[PDB]
CSV table of C-alpha atoms and ligand atoms in Angstrom, one decimal:
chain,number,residue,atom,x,y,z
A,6,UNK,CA,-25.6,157.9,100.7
A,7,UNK,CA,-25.7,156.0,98.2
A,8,UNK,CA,-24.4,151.5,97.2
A,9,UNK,CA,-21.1,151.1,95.3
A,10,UNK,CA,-21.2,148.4,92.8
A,11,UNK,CA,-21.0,144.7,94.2
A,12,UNK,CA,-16.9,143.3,94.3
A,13,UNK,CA,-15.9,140.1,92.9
A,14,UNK,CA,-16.9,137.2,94.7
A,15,UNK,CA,-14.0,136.0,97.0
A,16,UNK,CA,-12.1,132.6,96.8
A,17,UNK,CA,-13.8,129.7,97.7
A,18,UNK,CA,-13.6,127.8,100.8
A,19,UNK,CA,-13.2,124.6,99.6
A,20,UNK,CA,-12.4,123.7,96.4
A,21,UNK,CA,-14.6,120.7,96.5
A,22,UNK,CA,-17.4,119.3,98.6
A,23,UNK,CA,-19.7,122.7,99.1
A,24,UNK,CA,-17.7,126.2,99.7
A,25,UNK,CA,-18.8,129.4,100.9
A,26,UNK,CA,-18.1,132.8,98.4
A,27,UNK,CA,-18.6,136.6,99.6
A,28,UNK,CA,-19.3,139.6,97.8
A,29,UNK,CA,-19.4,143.1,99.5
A,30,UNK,CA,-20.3,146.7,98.9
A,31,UNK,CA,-19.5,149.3,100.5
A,32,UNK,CA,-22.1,152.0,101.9
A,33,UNK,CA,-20.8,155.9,101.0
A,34,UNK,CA,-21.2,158.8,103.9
A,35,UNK,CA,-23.6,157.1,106.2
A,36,UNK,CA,-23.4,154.4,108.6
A,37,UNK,CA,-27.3,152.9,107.8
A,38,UNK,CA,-27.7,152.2,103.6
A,39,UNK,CA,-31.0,150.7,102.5
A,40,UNK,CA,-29.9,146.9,101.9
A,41,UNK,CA,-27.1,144.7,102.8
A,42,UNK,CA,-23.2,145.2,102.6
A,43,UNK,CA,-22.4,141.2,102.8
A,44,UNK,CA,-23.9,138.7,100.7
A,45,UNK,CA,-23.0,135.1,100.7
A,46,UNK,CA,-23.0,132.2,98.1
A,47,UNK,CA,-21.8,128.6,97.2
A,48,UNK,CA,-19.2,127.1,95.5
A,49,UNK,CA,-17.7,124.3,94.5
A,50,UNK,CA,-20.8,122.0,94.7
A,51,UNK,CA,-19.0,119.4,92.6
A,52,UNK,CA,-18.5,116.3,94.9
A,53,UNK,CA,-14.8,115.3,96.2
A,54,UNK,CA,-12.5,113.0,94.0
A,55,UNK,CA,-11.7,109.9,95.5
A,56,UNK,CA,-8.3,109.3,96.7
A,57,UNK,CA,-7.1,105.9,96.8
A,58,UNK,CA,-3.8,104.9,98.8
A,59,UNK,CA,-2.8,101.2,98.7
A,60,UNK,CA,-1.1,99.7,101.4
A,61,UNK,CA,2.4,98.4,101.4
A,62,UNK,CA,2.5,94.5,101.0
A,63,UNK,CA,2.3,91.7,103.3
A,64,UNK,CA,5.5,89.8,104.2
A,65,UNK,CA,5.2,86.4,102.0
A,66,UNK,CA,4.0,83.7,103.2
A,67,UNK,CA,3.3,80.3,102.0
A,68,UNK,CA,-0.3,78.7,101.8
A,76,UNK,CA,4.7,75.1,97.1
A,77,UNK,CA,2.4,78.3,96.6
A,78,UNK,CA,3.4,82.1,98.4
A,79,UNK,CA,1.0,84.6,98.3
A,80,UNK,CA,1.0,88.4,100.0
A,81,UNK,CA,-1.8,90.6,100.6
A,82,UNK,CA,-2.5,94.1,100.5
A,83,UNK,CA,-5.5,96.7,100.8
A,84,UNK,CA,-6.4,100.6,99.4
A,85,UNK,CA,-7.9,103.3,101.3
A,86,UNK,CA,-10.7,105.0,100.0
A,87,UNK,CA,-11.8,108.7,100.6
A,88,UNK,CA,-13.5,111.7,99.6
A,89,UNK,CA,-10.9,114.4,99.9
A,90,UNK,CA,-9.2,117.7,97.7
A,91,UNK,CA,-5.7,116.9,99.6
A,92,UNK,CA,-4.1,113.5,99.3
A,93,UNK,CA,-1.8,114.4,102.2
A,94,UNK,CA,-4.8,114.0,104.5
A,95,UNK,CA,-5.1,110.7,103.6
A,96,UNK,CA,-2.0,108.1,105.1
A,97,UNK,CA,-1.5,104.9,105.9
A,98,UNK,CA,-1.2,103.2,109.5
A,99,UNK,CA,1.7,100.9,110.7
A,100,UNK,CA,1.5,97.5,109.6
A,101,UNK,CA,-0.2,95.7,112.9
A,102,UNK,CA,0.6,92.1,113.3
A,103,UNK,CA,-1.2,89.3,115.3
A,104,UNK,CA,0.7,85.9,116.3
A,105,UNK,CA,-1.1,82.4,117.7
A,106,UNK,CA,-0.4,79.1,118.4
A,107,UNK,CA,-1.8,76.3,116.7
A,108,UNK,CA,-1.4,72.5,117.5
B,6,UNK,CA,-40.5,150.9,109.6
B,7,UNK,CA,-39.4,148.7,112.4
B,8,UNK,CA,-37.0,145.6,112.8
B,9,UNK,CA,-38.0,142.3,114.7
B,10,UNK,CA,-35.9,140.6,117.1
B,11,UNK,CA,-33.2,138.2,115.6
B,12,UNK,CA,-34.0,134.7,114.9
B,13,UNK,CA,-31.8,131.6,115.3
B,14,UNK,CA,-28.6,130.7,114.3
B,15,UNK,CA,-29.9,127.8,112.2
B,16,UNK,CA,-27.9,124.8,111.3
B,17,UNK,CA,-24.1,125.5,110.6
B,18,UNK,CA,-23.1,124.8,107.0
B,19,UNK,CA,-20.1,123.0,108.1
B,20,UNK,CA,-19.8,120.3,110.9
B,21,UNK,CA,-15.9,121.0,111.4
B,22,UNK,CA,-13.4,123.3,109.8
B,23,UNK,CA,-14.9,126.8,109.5
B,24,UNK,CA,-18.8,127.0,108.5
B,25,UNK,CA,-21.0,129.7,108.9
B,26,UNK,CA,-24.4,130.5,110.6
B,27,UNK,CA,-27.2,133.3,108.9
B,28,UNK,CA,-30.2,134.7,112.2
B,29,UNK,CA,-32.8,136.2,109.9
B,30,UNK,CA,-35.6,139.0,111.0
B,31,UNK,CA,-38.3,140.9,109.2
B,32,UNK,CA,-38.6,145.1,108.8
B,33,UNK,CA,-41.8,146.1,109.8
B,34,UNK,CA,-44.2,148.4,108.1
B,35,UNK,CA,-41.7,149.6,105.3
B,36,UNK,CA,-39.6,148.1,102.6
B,37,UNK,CA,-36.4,150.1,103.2
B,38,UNK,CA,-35.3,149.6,106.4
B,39,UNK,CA,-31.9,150.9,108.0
B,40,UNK,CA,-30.0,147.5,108.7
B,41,UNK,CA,-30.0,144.1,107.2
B,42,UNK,CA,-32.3,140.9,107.8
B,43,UNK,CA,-29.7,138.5,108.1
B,44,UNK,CA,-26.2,138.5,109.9
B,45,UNK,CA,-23.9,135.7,109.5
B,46,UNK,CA,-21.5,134.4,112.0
B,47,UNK,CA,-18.6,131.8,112.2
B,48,UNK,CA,-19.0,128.4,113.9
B,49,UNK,CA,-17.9,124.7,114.1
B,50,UNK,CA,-13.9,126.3,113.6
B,51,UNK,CA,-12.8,123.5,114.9
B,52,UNK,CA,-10.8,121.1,112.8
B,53,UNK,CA,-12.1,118.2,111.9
B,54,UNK,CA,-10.9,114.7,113.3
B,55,UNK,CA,-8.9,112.3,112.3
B,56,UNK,CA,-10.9,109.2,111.4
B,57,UNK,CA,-9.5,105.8,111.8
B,58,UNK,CA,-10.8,102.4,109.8
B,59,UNK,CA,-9.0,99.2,110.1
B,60,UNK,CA,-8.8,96.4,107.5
B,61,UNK,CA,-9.7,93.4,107.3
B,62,UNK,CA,-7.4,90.7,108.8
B,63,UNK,CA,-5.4,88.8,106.3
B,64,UNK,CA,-6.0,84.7,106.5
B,65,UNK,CA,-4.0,82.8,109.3
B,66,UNK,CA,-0.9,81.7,107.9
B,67,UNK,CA,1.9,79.6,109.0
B,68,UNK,CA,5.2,81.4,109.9
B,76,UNK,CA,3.2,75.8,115.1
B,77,UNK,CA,2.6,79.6,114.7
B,78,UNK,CA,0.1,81.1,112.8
B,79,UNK,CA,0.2,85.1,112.1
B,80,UNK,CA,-2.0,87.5,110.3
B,81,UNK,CA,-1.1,91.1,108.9
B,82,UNK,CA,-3.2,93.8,108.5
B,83,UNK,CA,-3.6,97.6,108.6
B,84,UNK,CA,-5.5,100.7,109.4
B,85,UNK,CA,-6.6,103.7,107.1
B,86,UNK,CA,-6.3,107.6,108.9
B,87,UNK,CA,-8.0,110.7,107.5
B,88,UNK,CA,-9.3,114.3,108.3
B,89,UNK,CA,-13.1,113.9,107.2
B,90,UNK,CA,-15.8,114.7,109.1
B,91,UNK,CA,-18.7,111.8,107.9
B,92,UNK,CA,-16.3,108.1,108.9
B,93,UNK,CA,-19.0,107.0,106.0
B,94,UNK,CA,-16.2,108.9,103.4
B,95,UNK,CA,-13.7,106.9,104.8
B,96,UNK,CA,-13.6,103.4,103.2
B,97,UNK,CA,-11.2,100.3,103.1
B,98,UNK,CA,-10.9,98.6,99.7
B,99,UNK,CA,-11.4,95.2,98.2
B,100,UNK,CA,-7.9,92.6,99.3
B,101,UNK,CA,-5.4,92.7,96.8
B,102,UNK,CA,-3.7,89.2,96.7
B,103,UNK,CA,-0.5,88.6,94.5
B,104,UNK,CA,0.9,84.4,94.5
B,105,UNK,CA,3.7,82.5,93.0
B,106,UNK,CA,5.3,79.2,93.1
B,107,UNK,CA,8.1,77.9,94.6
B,120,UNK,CA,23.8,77.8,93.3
B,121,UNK,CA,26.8,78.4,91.7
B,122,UNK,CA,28.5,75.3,91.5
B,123,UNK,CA,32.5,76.3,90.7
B,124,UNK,CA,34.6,73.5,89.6
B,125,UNK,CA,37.8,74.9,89.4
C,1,LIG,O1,-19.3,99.0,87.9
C,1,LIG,S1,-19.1,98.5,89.3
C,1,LIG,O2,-20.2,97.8,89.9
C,1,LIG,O3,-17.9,97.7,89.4
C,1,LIG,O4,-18.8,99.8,90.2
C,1,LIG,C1,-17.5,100.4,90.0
C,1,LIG,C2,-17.4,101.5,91.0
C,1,LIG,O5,-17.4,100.9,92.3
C,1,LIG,C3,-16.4,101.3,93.2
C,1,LIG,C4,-16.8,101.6,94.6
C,1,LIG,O6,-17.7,100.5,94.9
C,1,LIG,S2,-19.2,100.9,95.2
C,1,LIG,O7,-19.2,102.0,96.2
C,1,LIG,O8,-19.9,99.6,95.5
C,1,LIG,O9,-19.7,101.4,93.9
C,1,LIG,O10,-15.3,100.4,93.2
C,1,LIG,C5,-15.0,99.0,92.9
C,1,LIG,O11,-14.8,98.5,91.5
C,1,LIG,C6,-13.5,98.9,91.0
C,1,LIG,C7,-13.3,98.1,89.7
C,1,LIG,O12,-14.0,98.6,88.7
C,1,LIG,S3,-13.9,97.6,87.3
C,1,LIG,O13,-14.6,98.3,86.1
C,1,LIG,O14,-14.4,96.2,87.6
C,1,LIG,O15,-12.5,97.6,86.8
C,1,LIG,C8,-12.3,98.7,91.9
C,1,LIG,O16,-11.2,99.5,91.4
C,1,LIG,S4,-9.8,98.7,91.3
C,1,LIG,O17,-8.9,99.0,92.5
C,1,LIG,O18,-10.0,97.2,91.2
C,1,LIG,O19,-8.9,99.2,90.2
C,1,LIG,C9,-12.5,99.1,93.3
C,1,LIG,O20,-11.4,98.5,94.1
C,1,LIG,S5,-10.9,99.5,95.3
C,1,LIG,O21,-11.2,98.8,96.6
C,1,LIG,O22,-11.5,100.9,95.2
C,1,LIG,O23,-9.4,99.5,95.3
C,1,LIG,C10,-13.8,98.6,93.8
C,1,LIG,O24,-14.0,99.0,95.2
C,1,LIG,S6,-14.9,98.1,96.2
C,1,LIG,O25,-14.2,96.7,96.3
C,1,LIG,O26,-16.3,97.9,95.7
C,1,LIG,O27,-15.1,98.8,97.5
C,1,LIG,C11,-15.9,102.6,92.5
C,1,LIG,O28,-14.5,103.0,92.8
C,1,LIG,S7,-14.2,104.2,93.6
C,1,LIG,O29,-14.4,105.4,92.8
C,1,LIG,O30,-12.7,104.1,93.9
C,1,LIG,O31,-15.0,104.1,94.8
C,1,LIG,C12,-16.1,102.3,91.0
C,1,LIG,O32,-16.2,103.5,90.2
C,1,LIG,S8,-15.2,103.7,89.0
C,1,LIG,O33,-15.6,104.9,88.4
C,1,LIG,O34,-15.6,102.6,88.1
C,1,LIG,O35,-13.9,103.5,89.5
C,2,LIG,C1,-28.2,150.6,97.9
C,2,LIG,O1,-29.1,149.4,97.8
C,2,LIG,C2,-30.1,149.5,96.8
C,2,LIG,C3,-29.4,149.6,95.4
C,2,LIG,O2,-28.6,148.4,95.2
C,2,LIG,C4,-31.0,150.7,97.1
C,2,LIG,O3,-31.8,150.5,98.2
C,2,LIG,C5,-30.2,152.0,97.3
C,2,LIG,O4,-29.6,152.5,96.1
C,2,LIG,C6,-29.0,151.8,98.3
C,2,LIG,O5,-28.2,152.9,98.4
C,3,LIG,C1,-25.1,144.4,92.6
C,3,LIG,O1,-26.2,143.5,92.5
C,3,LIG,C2,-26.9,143.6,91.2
C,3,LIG,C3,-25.9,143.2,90.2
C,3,LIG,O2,-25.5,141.9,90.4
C,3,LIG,C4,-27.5,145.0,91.1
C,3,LIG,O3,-28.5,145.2,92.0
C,3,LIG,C5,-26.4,146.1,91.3
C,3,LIG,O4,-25.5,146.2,90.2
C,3,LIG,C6,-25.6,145.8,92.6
C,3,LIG,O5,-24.6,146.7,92.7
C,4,LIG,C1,-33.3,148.3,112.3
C,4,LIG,O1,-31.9,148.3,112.6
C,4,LIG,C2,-31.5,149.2,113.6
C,4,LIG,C3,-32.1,148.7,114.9
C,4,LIG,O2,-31.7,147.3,115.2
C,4,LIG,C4,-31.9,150.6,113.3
C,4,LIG,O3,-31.0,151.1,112.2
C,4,LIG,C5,-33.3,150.8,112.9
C,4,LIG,O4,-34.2,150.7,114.1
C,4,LIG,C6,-33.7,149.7,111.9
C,4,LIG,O5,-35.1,149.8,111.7
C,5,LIG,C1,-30.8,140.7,117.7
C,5,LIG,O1,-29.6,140.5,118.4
C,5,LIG,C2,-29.8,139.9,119.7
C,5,LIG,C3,-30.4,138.5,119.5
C,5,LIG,O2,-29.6,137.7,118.7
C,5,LIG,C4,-30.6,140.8,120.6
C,5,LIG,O3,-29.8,142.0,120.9
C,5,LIG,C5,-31.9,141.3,119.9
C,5,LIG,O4,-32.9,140.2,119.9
C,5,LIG,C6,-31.6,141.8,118.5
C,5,LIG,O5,-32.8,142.0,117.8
């Protein structure tokens, strides 16, 4: 019986934001080797970029002066397609 | 050369989306036992939810009727403090073909 060399760490689990890494050996013609056949490590301990998505613009509208408004959405991600948008919401009153 | 009974599953490394727990215990009376002192298991698999932050309302304007635009910000995270909504982006201006044979 007798411990192989430890393998390449594995691919990290996430490429930002704190990942998890393996690296195995493998124990030869016995079932019980002195140590351990799994070790663990991280990865990737650099923060997340942050992605910013800006929103489409507001319908113009007069305050003669017009002006539109518009707003970004911040986050800490590694995929900007888990970061969207909502539908544009609009409230009405009456004033007198 | 003896092993202890397993210890707890600690904290999980990740709160969703795959993260992994380590139980540790001691060998007694020897330094090579058969085994290992830590096993590591999978936990919070669950994907993580979609969080949702709305912006700010946009000033009362005239269209009498007033209206008011705004909008909301959607994304997998799992700490809504990652999610942010940014500062208000504001853009203004001012404000015939006369054929004679
Ligand atoms: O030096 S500062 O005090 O200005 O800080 C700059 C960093 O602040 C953030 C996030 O705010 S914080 O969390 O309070 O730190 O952003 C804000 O400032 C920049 C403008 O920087 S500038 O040098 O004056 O040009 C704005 O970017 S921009 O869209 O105007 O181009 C941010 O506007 S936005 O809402 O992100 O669209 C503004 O954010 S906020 O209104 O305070 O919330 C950091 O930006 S972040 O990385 O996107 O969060 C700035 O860091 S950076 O490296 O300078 O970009
Ligand atoms: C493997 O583990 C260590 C060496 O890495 C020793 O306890 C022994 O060689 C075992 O086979
Ligand atoms: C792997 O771990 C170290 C090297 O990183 C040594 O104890 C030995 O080479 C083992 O296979
Ligand atoms: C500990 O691991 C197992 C028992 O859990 C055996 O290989 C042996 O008792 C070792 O000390
Ligand atoms: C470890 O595994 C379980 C507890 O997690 C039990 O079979 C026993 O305590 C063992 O040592």
């Amino acid at each position: 019986m007798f411990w192989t060399g430890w393998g390449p760490w594995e691919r990290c689990t996430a490429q930002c934001g704190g990942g998890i890494q393996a690296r195995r050996r493998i124990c030869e013609n016995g079932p019980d080797c002195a140590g351990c056949n799994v070790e663990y490590q991280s990865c990737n301990t650099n923060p997340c970029p942050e992605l910013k998505k800006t929103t489409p613009w507001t319908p113009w509208t007069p305050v003669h002066y017009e002006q539109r408004f518009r707003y970004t959405c911040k986050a800490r991600l590694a995929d900007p397609n888990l970061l969207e948008v909502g539908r544009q919401r609009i409230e009405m009153r009456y004033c007198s």
